[PDB]
Amino acid sequence: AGYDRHITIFSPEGRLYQVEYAFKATNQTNINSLAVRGKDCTVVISQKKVPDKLLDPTTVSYIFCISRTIGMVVNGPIPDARNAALRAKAEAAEFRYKYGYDMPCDVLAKRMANLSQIYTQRAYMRPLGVILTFVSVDEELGPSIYKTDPAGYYVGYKATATGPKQQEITTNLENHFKKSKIDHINEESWEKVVEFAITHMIDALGTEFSKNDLEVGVATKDKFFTLSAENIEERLVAIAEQD
Amino acid sequence: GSRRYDSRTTIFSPEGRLYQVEYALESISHAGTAIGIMASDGIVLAAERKVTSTLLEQDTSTEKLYKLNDKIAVAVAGLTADAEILINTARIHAQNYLKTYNEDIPVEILVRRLSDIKQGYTQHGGLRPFGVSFIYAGYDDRYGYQLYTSNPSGNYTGWKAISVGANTSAAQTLLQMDYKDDMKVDDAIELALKTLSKTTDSSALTYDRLEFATIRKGANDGEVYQKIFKPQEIKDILVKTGIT
Amino acid sequence: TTIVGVKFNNGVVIAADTRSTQGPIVADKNCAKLHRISPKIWCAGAGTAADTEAVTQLIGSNIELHSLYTSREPRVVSALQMLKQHLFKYQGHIGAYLIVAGVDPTGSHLFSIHAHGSTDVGYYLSLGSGSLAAMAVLESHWKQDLTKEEAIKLASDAIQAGIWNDLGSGSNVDVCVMEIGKDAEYLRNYLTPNVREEKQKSYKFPRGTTAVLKESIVNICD
Amino acid sequence: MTDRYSFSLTTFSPSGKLGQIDYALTAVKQGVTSLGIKATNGVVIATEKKSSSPLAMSETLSKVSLLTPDIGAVYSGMGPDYRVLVDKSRKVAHTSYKRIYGEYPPTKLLVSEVAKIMQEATQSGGVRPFGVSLLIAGHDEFNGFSLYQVDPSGSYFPWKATAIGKGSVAAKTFLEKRWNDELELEDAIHIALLTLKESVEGEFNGDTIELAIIGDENPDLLGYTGIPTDKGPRFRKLTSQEINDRLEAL
Amino acid sequence: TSIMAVTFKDGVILGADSRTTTGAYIANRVTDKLTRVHDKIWCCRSGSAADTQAIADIVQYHLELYTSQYGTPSTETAASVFKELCYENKDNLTAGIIVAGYDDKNKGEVYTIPLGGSVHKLPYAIAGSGSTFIYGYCDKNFRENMSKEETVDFIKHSLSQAIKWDGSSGGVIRMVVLTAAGVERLIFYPDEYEQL
Amino acid sequence: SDPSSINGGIVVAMTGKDCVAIACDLRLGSQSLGVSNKFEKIFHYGHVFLGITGLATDVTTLNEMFRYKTNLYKLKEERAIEPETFTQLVSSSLYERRFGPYFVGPVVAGINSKSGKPFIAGFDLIGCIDEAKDFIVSGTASDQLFGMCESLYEPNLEPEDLFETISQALLNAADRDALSGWGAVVYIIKKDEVVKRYLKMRQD
Amino acid sequence: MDIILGIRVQDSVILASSKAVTRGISVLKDSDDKTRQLSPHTLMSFAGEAGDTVQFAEYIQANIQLYSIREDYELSPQAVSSFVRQELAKSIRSRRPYQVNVLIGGYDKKKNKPELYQIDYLGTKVELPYGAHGYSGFYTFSLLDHHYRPDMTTEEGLDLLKLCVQELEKRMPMDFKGVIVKIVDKDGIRQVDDFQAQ
Amino acid sequence: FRNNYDGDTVTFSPTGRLFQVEYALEAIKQGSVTVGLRSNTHAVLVALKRNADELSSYQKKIIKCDEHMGLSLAGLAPDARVLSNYLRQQCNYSSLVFNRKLAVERAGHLLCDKAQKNTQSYGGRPYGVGLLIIGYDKSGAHLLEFQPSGNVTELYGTAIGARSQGAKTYLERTLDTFIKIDGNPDELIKAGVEAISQSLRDESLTVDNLSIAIVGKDTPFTIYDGEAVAKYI
Amino acid sequence: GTGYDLSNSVFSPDGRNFQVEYAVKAVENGTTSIGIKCNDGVVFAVEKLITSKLLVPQKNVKIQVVDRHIGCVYSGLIPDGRHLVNRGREEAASFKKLYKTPIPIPAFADRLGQYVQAHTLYNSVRPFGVSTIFGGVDKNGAHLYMLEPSGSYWGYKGAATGKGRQSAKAELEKLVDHHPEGLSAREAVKQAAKIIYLAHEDNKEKDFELEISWCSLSETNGLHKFVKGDLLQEAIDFAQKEIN
């Protein structure tokens, strides 16, 4: 009886505690991230926190290059995050091989969501305590942001945020869009979109950032890449000469 | 390990009873009642639809009477979905027999096979038994008209008249009270309706809450005919027998 | 069989004859050699008929399921990749030779696939026993930037070269145009240059001509 | 490793109840309302697009899905479960039917296939029942239009009209009042829109409502011409605009 | 078929004819035998078109997944994958592949995987039916560290001869230049190379 | 050696005005030895008719198979299968044995119960469908049947006329084939009724 | 091959089967009974490949007896024959097929009529007034085509066989060492121990 | 506490222990004592064979794995049969495939790894036996102590079993002495019998009660029982 | 309720996996071991508690090599550590076989990582009872890594685990601050010996044996080798000296 809380079967209330607790794990790293769409690019921002002085900061990342065109940022423990990353990379490579074209961001998202849905129904597999935000500039849909959770749920966003203070970032972003009346950052360059992203990350979190406190990934037509401490610095300087 | 979450659906109670079978039967007892009556010139199958609404499409509906063969049909009491699984394998077994011996499957052989499948979920595999009890109504050139009944345990038996589902005790006494070996299909049709009429947990016994079927050997032919009554047909036979 | 594919300024067209044959005997005087993989991806096949037809439907089926799963239009390269890997797997035992064409979100495409699994790309292609008669025509009239009409003509002319000069080909010409922005239009029997002349006599027999031994009614109803 | 869960996770309790199926049904009860009305020349299925954030793009999330060109589905309950069920339903329509007979399956049989898939998740080892209830609407040459409901137990039933989810009891009652065997498709679409309004708390328009129909053949949605026998899919999802137009006549 | 890869000062060049035949018939006269398995790692295919295409497609897949996990692969690694497939499946394949890639640390490299599935790293390599006729010529005119223009000339002449004598070769001469600068496609028509 | 030439036999089908006809010979031999002159090659499931030439054991096996499949189809579909549908069932069933085929030459004939339209079709041993409107031929004397049909046939023949035409095609083709004949039966099919007649023919 | 003949008369089915078992250059046995009783009213004769022959017969025998005990009933001759055909039809497409030809003669107690089924190793079944397997058919089919009548008594049937057996002993190259005749009728199966000179 | 975390080997206790393994180790302690020690030329195994009744035999405790290797057991006899048989194969494989005698150090690694598997997967049980392995390979005399935990250690000498602690302290004392008994087997054996007796209490090592095995430089692993050990009692 | 800590893959209400956390306890209860990343290689060293004078000195080696360029050291359940290396060795062999080039350190890290994370996904397995420090020199530099029973791992300048992980980390941090230019292979070997001697105080009761190994582009040609003889004694002394 009391085991309806250890494995993925229903509780008398029709709930799945394990999936709920898996959601809890997604905040364990106390990191916040957000993604916004440009005119022809997609940007993802994520807090980078390196506590130990013995760590090689270059190896501490939660952003992944899934394929030449798809980037993915994870919110949750790194081991589950890397499991999700490897699978996604594999899934994307196979897709291109079997179907002859690059796996679209939303499709990989659905696929990863379906795999997650399964840990939600089969008892021997545990859910992954992570939330996956996928981004790219799809050849058919243009700038794209699709996020999946431990419930096997997924949807596309105009922009989105994830983490402990997800709500503050979300309402901040919501407000900006209620104002702009469009579903994207009307900017030609991605550099300005990256700036916009960092700017609002600051307002919403009420925190200042140094080049080593952030992690940035950008997606453009035919390519997704991550920025370097210096590329960020250049971004941080730029925003500084406006405030 | 997993052992922690295993219900062990196939073990004996200290009294030498099979827990799941006993609990599945308990489940069956709340299912719409199904009645089977065997006459000299045919068999009657009548069942009470559990739960209905004004909006339920009764014309396209079937939840209790299923055709297995052209000479065999069953009345269901329990989980409809569980029943369909068993019904389908039963339909295949009938066809393998036909393809093999070029003769329609004798009623008991089909019933025994289905019962053996159930018996299986009782002795191995760790799966729950099927929450289903069947009343089989068939005809073959070796025993003629036959009536059988099988339940979760995998046990089956033959009857002149029998019921499964809710209020079987009441229904059996009523049947054991007015049944006569020399009955006639039309008599059985009436006995059946009366019995259901007295055991129903509902207000009245209307046609929208029933399924009816008869397996007769239409004298003007020489072959066996199965007839699954249509809404209108049940509504008629309902007025005639005096239930209006 | 004679099947061809011709790309034009805004699409692609495929054509084929309509003769089906068992050895030297014509089994079907008007079969359809043009198959549909998806609404806008059409295929023409030569070789073991059952194989071209089965492989076309199998991949077509999976292409539909894939389209529903990805919420996107099927892409010719996908039909190409799925077809070839399948044929390759079977080392040539599935005698399917096809010319697959179509339009999708990425443009118009023209490919050919062989039983062993190799694929080709080009602006004009032909396969089958009529392959050479047709290619001769295509090699003599094809030019870059053909109009939809010029393409239909060129393709139609190629299939004719086959019908007339190849014994493994004949009867009618089926065409199918796939233009980048519109629906694909299938032209069953676009040409019918082989109508049988009226027979010299009628062979209708006087009733009672045939000697019957026994007669009876057959039961259809159950 | 290896799934060592080869025993059932759904079993009979002393009372005769199958807990997991009951609990699954409870999950369905918490779900957003969805319904279906059968007309004389079409069927309509509809539901509310309960967007989980104004930042989410509700279009990229269809609660109403096409299974075959003449069959659609909608649900109430756990969305993720529904999704994989649609994937499986679309595939079984091919593997178990189109690939054998060369024609799409009639509504009752496909429903039967789906139901089978769900029944198995009620008895197979190591799994939990699907936490959803579906409403499938379709049309086939020999059975005409039909509407079915498939529950977590794997049981299904045909309806003239019905509702599932949150305010199903209320909606069912409202339908019983307005339904008759002479409703035209447009009439049903209207009745549908009315029933759904009682179940929607906030905004009620063509962007918050998802509605589809099984009606006449749409040759314009076929993708090709040249084959007389191929007339187009009967399943069509209404556009945000098409909905609003009918809302002004609400 | 006549194909070759030549390393030179700035990187490497791959060339090939465009004729694929089934008997004496030219099934395709504009074939592109220069296949890309990675940005700056290409190959020349000879033997069974069905086999070499399948091989290449698998390799491309492997290098794509490899890149996802470990970054850009060395040309030596690409040649290792081809080898693994060719050697391990030697009984069912008829493939002769020339692998040529451009790395920044290793500049240009050429590997040849003949029928058996063995691997050979070389300054340049020739293969295909038509290659037999240019062994003498190529041995006599190849020089290490030639200039792009010199290399394009060497390949253009060598192949023009191969095409001249081997009926299984012909059509146009395609080339692919692989250097730090990027990737460049080159083509040469009969009217030009036939009169060299 | 050739599975399709061991037993012998032929089948032919034709369309007429609101009618269809399917006919076959009765021979079953083992090479030169005639064995049975009662081996009919036409069967029917509901109102759909199927004739099968080729290896006798496969003829029998396929019949038992399609009865099996059409029976389940009726139980699930709750209606009898139609000619068009059955033709597809036959095709997929044959192709399913692509690399170990049944050595048969099937022929389907019937009237679509809903559209009243006449329907016939033929298949090669691996399922390739041949859908002709006029006539389908099969068997060891197929060349002859093709010749007879192509000459004797004409559209919209009436039932009583289509009978003469089909019987004359079967009979004369059979008489130029050492492995066919030894009796024959013809089926005249209309929406409502079906007549079966045994023809009188050479017994050599 | 061996001689396997069968003839269905008015009220019975008679099965004649050669007694020789020859391997190469030597006739190893001259009293071989090439028959197995499947059920009290069903008899099966067989000829073919050395080992497959009996192994198959006994296998079918075992299955029919199992059916009989499970159902406490005797399958009709038609049913038993259909079962045997399917067994052979499965066999023909297996790794090593049973190369066996058989004649199944049985009396159908329900129809009260004798039945003769001929089935070859490919699973080819046909019901006949008279049948034969192998080279025998070449000289016995026209004989019977001439001297056979549906209303013949069991006695006329035995005379008919004797006529077949004589033709076989005159024109056949092999010495099949006579035949063993068995009668299947409403009263079961009995053997005619006196055919060596009847 | 413990009761909730000792149901199977796949469960860690809150303090990081694996009770099922520990209970396995407990079967060893309950097992009869056995001793191992080596010089630079030989390695010896001295084991006290235990008997049920006075009508029963004294269960063998030494098993030869190859001409150059062997071990002594303390705990579940069957498990030692299983493990020694495995070691016999590993030795056998080394010779047949590489024509190389298996290094005693490698034998240990193989034993550790085999034991470890039965401590990380559901359904299995740890081996309930301790093993002392001696052998002479290309690097001289060797002595290994094998515990079901998977831990294998190379020592100069040691003992396992009941009261094994006696012999162990004795050897830790005699160390400098016996380690130099090169070229003289009888002396190493005596030094072993003296170490083992340091764990007696119940009785005294008799003839059909003592069991000794030796291996070294020019001595193929051989077992001595009964009369053969009389000259050491 | 409770019991969330009895099955391995179960999420506790606060999103944790207690069995993995308990695995950590087994690690903290083990010997201390470290890794120091130098300017062109990495150094590994570990504490080897001397249970008795019976342990043949220098024999029971702990540091393990993978392929020819990787070194691995761990604290906790030793048998588990060997298991993990056996896997890494296969993982490496597989990689070399297909790609020819010996496996890059990062690539190797994830191989170990994914495998370890895998053992936190099912209740039919136990998590690894070891934290492992490993690294080497590859196509582009030296890399030091530490992997937890959770499967988590990161790149490190210096790393320590086991009983004296705090003393060690304290010491390592000093080094990191006082040497922004990078320590040298020769220097790191000594520094390593000291850190173990220091971190041995948390176990000052039992005597121990030192073990060092390294992989330096200049000192070992990029191959993993064990520090022996003179170089070892020289480092042992450098420690024995700064311990007073």
Curated annotation (Swiss-Prot), chain A:
Keywords, sorted A to Z: Acetylation, Cytoplasm, Isopeptide bond, Nucleus, Phosphoprotein, Proteasome, Ubl conjugation
Localisation per UniProt entry: Cytoplasm; Nucleus
Highest taxon in the source lineage: Eukaryota
Gene3D superfamilies, alphabetized: Glutamine Phosphoribosylpyrophosphate, subunit 1, domain 1
Cellular component, GO, one term: proteasome core complex, alpha-subunit complex
UniProt key word Lyase: no
Keyword Ubl conjugation in annotation: yes
SUPFAM superfamilies documented for this protein: N-terminal nucleophile aminohydrolases (Ntn hydrolases) (SSF56235)
GO biological process entries: proteasomal ubiquitin-independent protein catabolic process; proteasome-mediated ubiquitin-dependent protein catabolic process
Principal subcellular localization: cytoplasm
Cross-link (Glycyl lysine isopeptide (Lys-Gly) (interchain with G-Cter in ubiquitin)): K223
PROSITE patterns from the UniProt entry: PROTEASOME_ALPHA_1 (PS00388), PROTEASOME_ALPHA_2 (PS51475)
Modified residues (Phosphoserine): S228
Oligomeric and partner information: The 26S proteasome consists of a 20S proteasome core and two 19S regulatory subunits. The 20S proteasome core is composed of 28 subunits that are arranged in four stacked rings, resulting in a barrel-shaped structure. The two end rings are each formed by seven alpha subunits, and the two central rings are each formed by seven beta subunits. The catalytic chamber with the active sites is on the inside of the barrel. Interacts with CIC1.
PANTHER family recorded: PROTEASOME SUBUNIT ALPHA/BETA
Family to which this protein belongs: Belongs to the peptidase T1A family.
Note: Present with 15200 molecules/cell in log phase SD medium.
Protein name: Proteasome subunit alpha type-1
Organism: Saccharomyces cerevisiae (strain ATCC 204508 / S288c) (Baker's yeast)
Gene expressing this chain: SCL1
UniProtKB/Swiss-Prot annotation, chain C:
Keyword set includes Protease: yes
Cellular compartment(s): Cytoplasm; Nucleus
GO cellular component: cytosol; nucleus; proteasome complex; proteasome core complex, beta-subunit complex; proteasome storage granule
Gene Ontology molecular functions: endopeptidase activity; threonine-type endopeptidase activity
Catalytic reaction(s) noted: Cleavage of peptide bonds with very broad specificity
Pfam families, per the entry: Pr_beta_C, Proteasome
Record EC number: 3.4.25.1
GO biological process: proteasomal ubiquitin-independent protein catabolic process; proteasome-mediated ubiquitin-dependent protein catabolic process
Residues at the active site: T1
Enzyme class of the recorded protein, top EC level: hydrolase
Keyword Nucleus: yes
Keywords on record: Cytoplasm, Hydrolase, Nucleus, Protease, Proteasome, Threonine protease, Zymogen
Function: The proteasome degrades poly-ubiquitinated proteins in the cytoplasm and in the nucleus. It is essential for the regulated turnover of proteins and for the removal of misfolded proteins. The proteasome is a multicatalytic proteinase complex that is characterized by its ability to cleave peptides with Arg, Phe, Tyr, Leu, and Glu adjacent to the leaving group at neutral or slightly basic pH. It has an ATP-dependent proteolytic activity.
Stated family: Belongs to the peptidase T1B family.
Note: The side chain of Thr-1 acts as a nucleophile, and the N-terminal amino group acts as a proton acceptor. Present with 11400 molecules/cell in log phase SD medium.
Name of protein: Proteasome subunit beta type-2
UniProt source species: Saccharomyces cerevisiae (strain ATCC 204508 / S288c)
Gene: PUP1
Curated annotation (Swiss-Prot), chain H:
Location in or out of the cell: Cytoplasm; Nucleus
Origin superkingdom: Eukaryota
Keyword vocabulary terms for this entry: Cytoplasm, Isopeptide bond, Nucleus, Phosphoprotein, Proteasome, Ubl conjugation
Key word Coiled coil present: no
InterPro entries noted in UniProt: Ntn_hydrolases_N (IPR029055), Proteasome_alpha (IPR050115), Proteasome_alpha-type (IPR023332), Proteasome_asu_N (IPR000426), Proteasome_sua/b (IPR001353)
Sequence position, cross-link Glycyl lysine isopeptide (Lys-Gly) (interchain with G-Cter in ubiquitin): K190
Other comment: Present with 7210 molecules/cell in log phase SD medium.
Protein's name according to its UniProt entry: Proteasome subunit alpha type-6
Swiss-Prot record, chain I:
Post-translational modification summary for this protein: The alpha and beta forms are probably products of the same gene with different post-translational modifications.
A single GO cellular-component term on record: proteasome complex
Keywords annotated in UniProt: Acetylation, Cytoplasm, Nucleus, Proteasome
One GO BP annotation of this record: proteasomal ubiquitin-independent protein catabolic process
Cellular localization per UniProt: Cytoplasm; Nucleus
Molecular function per GO: mRNA binding
Domain of life of the source: Eukaryota
Protein function: The proteasome degrades poly-ubiquitinated proteins in the cytoplasm and in the nucleus. It is essential for the regulated turnover of proteins and for the removal of misfolded proteins. The proteasome is a multicatalytic proteinase complex that is characterized by its ability to cleave peptides with Arg, Phe, Tyr, Leu, and Glu adjacent to the leaving group at neutral or slightly basic pH. It has an ATP-dependent proteolytic activity.
Family statement: Belongs to the peptidase T1A family.
Subunit structure: The 26S proteasome consists of a 20S proteasome core and two 19S regulatory subunits. The 20S proteasome core is composed of 28 subunits that are arranged in four stacked rings, resulting in a barrel-shaped structure. The two end rings are each formed by seven alpha subunits, and the two central rings are each formed by seven beta subunits. The catalytic chamber with the active sites is on the inside of the barrel.
Miscellaneous comment text of the record: Present with 12000 molecules/cell in log phase SD medium.
Gene name in the database record: PRE10
Residues included from the entire protein: 5 to 248 of 288
